[PDB]
Design brief:
Chain A: This is Coatomer subunit zeta-1. This is part of a larger assembly, with chains A, B and C. Chain A is an alpha+beta fold. Chain A is built from five helices and seven strands, in the order ββαβββαααββα. By secondary structure, chain B is an all-alpha fold. In chain B, helix 2 packs antiparallel against helix 3. The chains are: A alpha+beta, B mainly alpha, C alpha+beta.
């Protein structure tokens, strides 16, 4: 039981606006931020549903001032991961009552924290239905 | 006479150890055959010296690394050496208590030619005609 | 954003009277923020905050409940007296609504430990069966965590877990099947039953397929009892649902290790399954690949090629381009290498920085991995040296040089020499070390060493200590290997450079003094070619693969020797007949990893047989001591001694032996059957590998019989001329008996039966007899135990069945009698 390695929603530098680690491989801030900077540097300023970083398929999207991440295994493809990443974007948008930017996330830090935990649970994909997550969470 | 104690904390400690091998290899035994002792006399040192160079031996709670520095150097010369166990004769000690070629002045033979900061500027000066 | 101290502190008011759901929930949000933003909690204040929050569980608000679940999990480990929160979580967990249901099970189960396991079970059973994915999936992941604390509680849930498995809902199923596989496992077979039930089904759950593919990927033919095929009717071997990841995972395993063979609607040996998905968008990345494939990656490679090759060349986007190189690499192979190398050459042009280093490494690495000649590898290694000039490193000097001395060395040094012309001190410590090491070691007569020396001499001045030290020592070895060289050594070493710097001096003083002053017994000894400091494997090629898209020794050779060694350690067996031979037909008494694994071999000596029983107690509940394998011979054999296996704990082999004396007058065979029973003392054990209880009971385990054949007594040989040998061994021990082999209708089978049974190789290759000939003479030879030859002559008559008069001669009465009896 494992698909998603980690979820990060990063500003346009790779610094932690947010990350919640569905791996046990980053718990300390220094390394959680390093990871975040690492994934953001590869993936950014080339938007696609694919990136390969650290031998893992990284699926990412972007907004005005954020890049949104799911990191998962590379034995899969973008599309499986993408379903998590689409939930992540979508659910935060509907939850916060505003599209994902740094402003929406900061506006409601609580909605963001709770919403992401419903999407991924210890690296298993707990939820992937944006609607379900949003009802499930209370602001 | 300290030497097992001093060496041993380092020998089981870590840091960066490539070039360490070369220098310890020619070095560890030297000077007087049995004139130390803390829990390892000069002989333990020759044992150690040989292990650090490229051999294997329990002595100073084992050496940090054994595998030598840059490809040409290897263990072997010194391993052969220590004919007379770390003693001033015709061994490592000899080499250690002697200086390779002429060493005099500030002609750069074990020297560096004035004060290090002034020299950078002099080296820079190409003196192109 | 926040300060961890202030927020951890103000939380302590909850512990008293104030509960204020708004204030506390905010304070909680702040805790989650401190972690999220990236901060570390202080333990005293954390411990205090944790005891305080539990009061807050009284007030049931969905946002406050939510805050409480995330905060207790994060604060759980950095807190004390957490046990109080279990009750509050159960209270929450039974409360209907997904907000409580799912999030509570997860928070509760994380805090829950084996004592507490029992409490959560009613609520857990109710939460697992849900087709509402949140409650069920959280409960399913929760159960996974709980397998650690206590296995047994979780196991009972297998029925609720299975119930969820029957959903086609993606989460409920993914979680259900995944978890089940982990849970119910006590043996392979019970998990396999769980998988077969879902297996016939065309899911619309890609995640379940994926998690299951992994379980499935190996051939399973015991799914739900048994079945006649490795069959997976869920995409693993089938392609019921198309979706490029699932399709890729499935296609690479099935092709050359069938999960099932190819179907018209589901390729599974053929290369196709990947390829139909292959032209695509970003999605293509899974699709385009390969791995394994029938019979090679290469017929496969051609399909996909348009896609991988155009993206790889065109896209100087890192994200696309990486997928394109990995995809090229995958469609690759031995054959593909011509194509792969041009592409990789091309690739650096798109991304050129590290990627440059990687392509010049890749083209060499691929040439070493996939052979286009070892020479070409060196030539590519030159191109790597040329292009980068510094991203070669130290590990490269050792790897290039070791690799090079397989063939390239004279050339490599020379190439290196040219390469050294580059750049005097920006070329690095490493290249100078490579030309230096190679020029030292080869001692060029292929080119004049004078260019090499002149090149190295300049480099040393302005480059690092390690190379300058390298240069003196190399020179010394260079002296010892070649006499000629000594004059250059002297001009170089007197200089302030190659000696008299720092490290360079110390090494030099030694190396110099040994060459100059001393005998050079040492110097001579030291150069064995002038080789590197270590010989690793070929490091580059694996490194390169990931990086781009970002002494077994033996004694025995014969069964008799290995056994003889095992026997020899024990005294009795070599003291009481020495071993002629040991069986060429050792029979395993009891099957592997059941109750016992016992393999017995019968060993023949001059007058004895020793039976070595290698005994394993694979009994999980026991550990054994004082174990022996007891024996009842079915003929006149004396059982002299038993040697015990000292201990046989769980899954640990031990050996026990029975020594018996052979008859040496027996009129009937030494082909004989012994009934084996192992007897032992059991002390109770908790399965690990071993552990004994303070007291125990006697127990016995029955074993299979050991059969001793004439084949064990005789070692086979043929003779150039049977007739002489046949007379020579002893016609004085001659006995003749006539047999009918009615179950063998030709000579060729007949000769084979006497040859196998007796352990005699028929002479002159007499196992091949003229097919269906009326008379034939079969010549047998071999040596019997004790070291005496046994020859047997069987004059075959072929009617419709085989009749033979078998006459045997031997240096003893016993082989003759033994052969004659065993055959019939």
């Amino acid at each position: 039981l494992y698909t998603v390695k980690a979820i990060l929603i990063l500003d346009n530098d790779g610094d932690r606006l947010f990350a919640k680690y569905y791996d046990d491989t980053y718990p300390s801030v220094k390394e959680q931020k390093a990871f975040e900077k690492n994934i953001f540097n590869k993936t950014h300023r080339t938007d696609s549903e694919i990136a390969l970083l650290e031998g893992l398929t990284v699926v990412y999207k972007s907004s005005i001032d954020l890049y949104f991440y799911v990191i998962g295994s590379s034995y899969e493809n973008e599309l499986m991961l993408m379903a998590v990443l689409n939930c992540l974007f979508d659910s935060l948008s509907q939850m916060l009552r505003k599209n994902v930017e740094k402003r929406a996330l900061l506006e409601n830090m609580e909605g963001l924290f709770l919403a992401v935990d419903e999407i991924v649970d210890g690296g298993v994909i707990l939820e992937s239905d944006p609607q379900q997550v949003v009802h499930r969470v209370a602001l | 006479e300290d030497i097992q104690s001093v060496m041993t904390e380092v020998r089981r400690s870590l840091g960066e150890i490539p070039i360490v091998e070369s220098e310890i290899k020619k070095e560890a035994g030297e000077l007087k055959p049995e004139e130390e002792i803390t829990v390892g006399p000069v002989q333990k040192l020759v044992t150690e010296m040989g292990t650090y160079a490229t051999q294997s031996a329990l002595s100073s709670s084992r050496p940090t690394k054994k595998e030598e520095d840059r490809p040409p150097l290897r263990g072997f010369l010194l391993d052969g050496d220590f004919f007379v166990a770390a003693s001033l004769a015709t061994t490592l000690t000899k080499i250690a208590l002697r200086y390779v070629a002429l060493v005099q002045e500030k002609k750069k033979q074990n020297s560096f030619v004035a004060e290090a900061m002034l020299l950078m500027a002099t080296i820079l000066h190409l003196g192109k005609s | 954003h926040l300060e961890k101290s202030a927020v951890l502190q103000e939380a302590r008011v909850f512990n008293e009277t104030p509960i204020n759901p708004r204030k506390c929930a905010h304070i909680l949000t702040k805790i989650l923020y401190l972690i999220n933003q990236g901060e570390h909690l202080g333990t005293t204040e954390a411990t205090e905050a944790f005891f305080a929050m539990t009061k807050l569980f009284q007030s049931n608000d969905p946002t406050l409940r939510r805050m409480c679940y995330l905060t207790i999990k994060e604060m759980s480990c950095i807190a004390e007296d957490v046990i109080i929160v279990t009750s509050s979580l159960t209270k929450d967990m039974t409360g209907k609504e997904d907000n409580y249901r799912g999030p509570a099970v997860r928070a509760l189960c994380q805090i829950t430990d084996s004592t507490m396991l029992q409490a959560v079970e009613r609520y857990m059973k109710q939460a697992i069966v849900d087709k509402v994915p949140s409650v069920s999936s959280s409960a399913l992941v929760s159960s996974l965590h709980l397998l650690k604390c206590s296995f047994d509680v979780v196991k009972r849930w297998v029925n609720e877990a299975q119930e969820a498995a029957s959903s086609d809902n993606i989460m409920v199923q993914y979680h259900a099947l995944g978890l089940l596989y982990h849970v119910r496992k006590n043996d392979r077979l019970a998990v396999s039953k769980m998988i077969s039930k879902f297996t016939r089904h065309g899911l619309k759950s890609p995640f379940a397929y994926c998690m299951m593919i992994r379980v499935a990927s190996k051939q399973l033919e015991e799914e739900d009892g048994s079945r006649d095929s490795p069959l997976f009717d869920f995409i693993e071997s089938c392609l019921r649902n198309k979706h490029e990841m699932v399709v890729y995972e499935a296609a690479s395993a099935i092709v050359n290790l069938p999960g099932c063979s190819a179907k018209e609607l589901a390729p599974a040996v053929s290369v196709l399954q990947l390829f139909c998905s292959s032209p695509k968008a970003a999605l293509r990345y899974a699709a385009v690949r390969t791995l394994n494939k029938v019979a090679m990656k290469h017929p496969s490679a051609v399909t996909a090629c348009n896609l991988d090759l155009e993206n790889l060349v065109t896209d100087s986007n890192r994200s696309i381009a990486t997928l394109a190189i990995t995809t090229l690499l995958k469609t690759g192979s031995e054959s593909s290498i011509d194509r792969l190398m041009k592409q990789i050459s091309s690739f650096m042009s798109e991304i050129s920085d590290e990627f440059k280093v990687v392509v010049v490494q890749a083209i060499s690495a691929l040439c070493q991995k996939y052979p286009r000649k070892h020479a070409v590898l060196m030539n590519f290694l030159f191109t790597m040296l040329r292009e980068e000039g510094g991203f070669e490193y130290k590990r490269a000097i050792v790897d290039c040089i070791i690799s090079i001395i397989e063939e390239n060395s004279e050339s490599k040094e020379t190439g290196l020499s040219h390469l050294c012309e580059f750049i005097e001190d920006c070329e690095f410590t490493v290249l100078a070390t490579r030309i230096l090491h190679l020029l030292g070691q080869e001692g060029p007569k292929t080119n004049n060493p004078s260019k090499y020396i002149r090149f190295i001499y300049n480099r040393v001045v302005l480059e690092h200590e390690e190379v300058r030290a390298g240069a003196v020592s190399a020179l010394a070895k260079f002296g010892a290997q070649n006499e000629e060289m000594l004059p250059s050594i002297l001009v170089l070493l007197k200089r302030c450079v190659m000696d008299d710097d720092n490290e360079v001096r110390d090494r030099a003083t030694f190396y110099l003094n040994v060459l100059e002053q001393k005998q050079k017994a040492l110097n001579a000894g030291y150069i064995l070619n002038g080789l590197t400091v270590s010989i690793p494997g070929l490091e580059k090629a694996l490194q390169q693969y990931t990086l781009e898209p970002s002494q077994p020794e033996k004694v025995a050779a014969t069964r008799q020797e290995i056994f003889q060694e095992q026997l020899a350690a024990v005294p009795e067996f070599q003291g009481l007949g020495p071993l002629f031979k040991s069986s060429p037909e050792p029979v395993a008494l009891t099957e592997s990893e059941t109750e016992y694994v016992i393999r017995c071999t019968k060993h023949t000596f001059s007058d004895h047989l020793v039976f070595q029983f290698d005994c394993t107690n694979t009994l999980n509940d026991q550990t054994l001591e004082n174990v022996t394998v007891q024996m009842e011979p079915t003929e006149a054999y004396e059982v002299l001694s038993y040697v015990p296996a000292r201990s046989l704990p769980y899954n640990q082999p031990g050996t026990c032996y029975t020594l018996v004396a052979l008859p040496t007058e027996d009129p009937t065979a030494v082909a004989c059957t012994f009934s084996c029973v192992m007897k032992f003392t059991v002390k109770d054990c908790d399965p690990n590998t071993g552990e004994i209880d303070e007291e125990g009971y006697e127990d016995e385990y029955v074993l299979e019989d050991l059969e001793v054949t004439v084949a064990d007594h005789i070692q086979k040989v043929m003779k150039v001329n049977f007739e002489a040998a046949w007379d020579e061994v002893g016609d004085e021990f001659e006995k003749e008996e006539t047999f009918t082999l009615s179950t063998i209708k030709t000579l060729e089978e007949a000769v084979g039966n006497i040859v196998k049974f007796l352990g005699m190789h028929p002479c002159e290759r007499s196992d091949k007899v003229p097919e269906n000939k009326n008379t034939h003479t079969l010549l047998l030879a071999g040596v019997f135990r004790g070291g005496h030859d046994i020859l047997v002559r069987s004059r075959l008559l072929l009617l419709d069945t085989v009749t033979m008069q078998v006459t045997a001669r031997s240096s003893e009465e016993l082989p003759v009698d033994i052969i004659l009896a065993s055959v019939g």
